[PDB]
């Protein structure tokens, strides 16, 4: 923002999450007593794996975004053995944990999350910033329970052709991405459809036992609905999960979808 931070400026608290590259800790800035989240990345581990570039992007992109449904990146610093990301702290945790707790959400909570996410993505896209990694593990919850897009690790500017090695599951990736083709903002609209389905059903629509199998379901767009998913929900999800990118709706149409309108509270 202006000044340069150091570890000594923070009292680290309890672990929020422990991952492959780093951990996320609750932390408080000594002087102002400001409560935030500190993501500690080991570096050597970054240096291996050649991830140094993506991190500059993630930080560069996320630190320049200001939206109520987008977790903020206030700044960063490093030392000899690692890098620190100073993030806004989301008090209610991940959407993933909420989902794992309730099993599945009702139409109202889902419609509200989709809405908040569409606004968030609407803002990102107004900057040709495509997220490409929308999944429940990357969505946090604010003090009022509002959804916050949180992890811009795989974020890039559109249009892009980046053939990045897909390491996690392909569960949220669209056909154009799992096939190494060029892609734009429509990628996020597919993820949104996958997300809407996971929220209501409890499992992503293309889930399978092998990467290779999931790959097939995605490219062929083979998904079915359990009896309890309603017509309006099936409808929105079907418009979003279109193999042809140009056929997926605009976030505006999503926000104005009858089902998103009857059930959304936000
Ligand atoms: O997947 C993960 O485990 C994960 C992913 C991202 C992450 N990063 C941030 C950043 C800002 N704010 C928060 N809030 C938070 C609060 C409580 C809990 C909890 O479960 O007690 C988890 C998260 N987390 C932390 C953990």
Residues of the chain with CATH 1.10.510.10: 94-266
- For residue 255, count CB atoms less than 10 angstroms from its CB and return exposed for 0-12, middle for 13-18, buried for 19 or more: middle
The preferred substitution site among 40, 84, 140, 141 for testing ligand 1, maximizing ligand atoms within 8 Å of CB, is 140
∠ Cα 82 86 92 (to 5°): 120
Chain mean position to CA 211? 20
Give the per-residue SS3 of 177-233. HHCCCCECCHHHHHHHHHHHHHHHHCCCCCCCCCHHHHHHHHHCCCCCCCCCCCHHH
Instruction: Answer whether 266's CB lies under 8 Å from 116's CB.
Output: yes
Resolution in A: 2.5
Taking the CA of residue 97 as reference, the ligand 1 atom at the shortest distance is 20
Q: What is the CATH number of domain 94-266?
A: 1.10.510.10
CA distance 208 to 202: 14
Residues of the chain with CATH 3.30.200.20: 5-93
- Overall fold of domain 5-93: Phosphorylase Kinase; domain 1 (3.30.200)
CA distance 191 to 174: 7
Pocket, ligand 1, Cβ cutoff 6 A: 16-17, 24, 37, 87, 89-90, 93-94, 97, 137, 140, 150
Alpha carbons within 13 angstroms on the beta-carbon side of residue 52 total 7
């Amino acid at each position: 923002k202006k000044r340069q931070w150091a570890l000594e400026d923070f009292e680290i608290g309890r672990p929020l999450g422990k991952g492959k590259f780093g951990n996320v800790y609750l932390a408080r800035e000594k002087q102002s007593k400001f409560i935030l989240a500190l993501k500690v990345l080991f570096k050597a581990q970054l240096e291996k794996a050649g991830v140094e570039h993506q991190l500059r992007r993630e930080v560069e992109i996320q630190s320049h975004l200001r939206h109520p449904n987008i977790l903020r990146l206030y700044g960063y610093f490093h030392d000899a053995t690692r890098v620190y990301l100073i993030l806004e702290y989301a008090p209610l945790g991940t959407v993933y944990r909420e989902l794992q707790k309730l099993s599945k959400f009702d139409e109202q909570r889902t419609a509200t999350y989709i809405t908040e996410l569409a606004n968030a993505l609407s803002y990102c896209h107004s900057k040709r910033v495509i997220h490409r990694d929308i999944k429940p593990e990357n969505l946090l919850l604010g003090s009022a329970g509002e959804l916050k897009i949180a992890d811009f690790g795989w974020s890039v500017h559109a249009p892009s052709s980046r053939r990045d090695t897909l390491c996690g599951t392909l569960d949220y990736l669209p056909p154009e991405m799992i096939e190494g083709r060029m892609h734009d903002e429509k990628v996020d609209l597919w993820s949104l459809g996958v997300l809407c389905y996971e929220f209501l059903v409890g499992k992503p629509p293309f889930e399978a036992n092998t990467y290779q199998e999931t790959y097939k379901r995605i490219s062929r767009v083979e998904f079915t609905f359990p009896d309890f998913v309603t017509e309006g929900a099936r409808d929105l999800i079907s418009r979003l999960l279109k193999h042809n990118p140009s056929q997926r709706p605009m976030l505006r149409e999503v926000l104005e979808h009858p089902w998103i309108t009857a059930n959304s509270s936000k």
